[PDB]
Amino acid sequence: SATAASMNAVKDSLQRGQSTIDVALAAGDTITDLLGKMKEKALAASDTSLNTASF
Amino acid sequence: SATAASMNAVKDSLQRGQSTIDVALAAGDTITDLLGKMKEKALAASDTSLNTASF
């Protein structure tokens, strides 16, 4: 029965690991959106017919 | 009949031995519970994803 108590101790650590990964995933989604937008900006600026004040 | 009187003397010592072993057993049960709890604590602390203030 001591071992069953220890399993009770293990489950919380597994849950904490889940939580940390969720936070990381949220930040990652935001970062991927920002990277898409940055690609759009760089692509738009790669144009050689552009004015000096839009670059 | 002297021997029967001596048996009367022996029974009390046997009973005293029983009593001492009961006290020891009670303390031992408490100790085993404490050891289970200590294992749980050590297992929980063996985690490397843990903060510096929970250790």
The DSSP-derived string for B1-55 is -HHHHHHHHHHHHHHHHHHHHHHHHHHHHHHHHHHHHHHHHHHHHT-TT--TTT-
Rounded Cα distance, A40 and A45, in Å: 9
Resolution expressed in Å: 3.4
Mutate to test the interface with A, among B33, B40, B41, B55 (most CBs of A within 10 A): B40
Q: What's the gap in Å between the CA of A42 and the closest CA on chain B? A: 39
Rounded Cα distance, A12 and B2, in Å: 69
Q: What's the gap in Å between the CA of B26 and the closest CA on chain A? A: 18
State whether residue A15 sits within 8 Å of chain B by CB: no
Burial string for A29-48 (b: 16+ CB within 10 Å, else e) reads: eeeeeeeeeeeeeeeeeeee
CB contact under 8 A, A6 and B49: no
Rounded Cα distance, B40 and A3, in Å: 9
A4 C-beta neighbours (distance < 10 Å), count? 8
CB contact under 8 A, A9 and B43: yes
Nearest C-alpha neighbor of B36 from the set A47, A4, A14, A32: A4
Residue B11 in tokens: 């029974």
Rounded Cα distance, B46 and B53, in Å: 14
Experimental method: cryo-EM
Rounded Cα distance, A1 and B3, in Å: 50
Q: What is the 3-state secondary structure (H, E, C) of chain A?
A: CHHHHHHHHHHHHHHHHHHHHHHHHHHHHHHHHHHHHHHHHHHHHCCCCCCCCCC
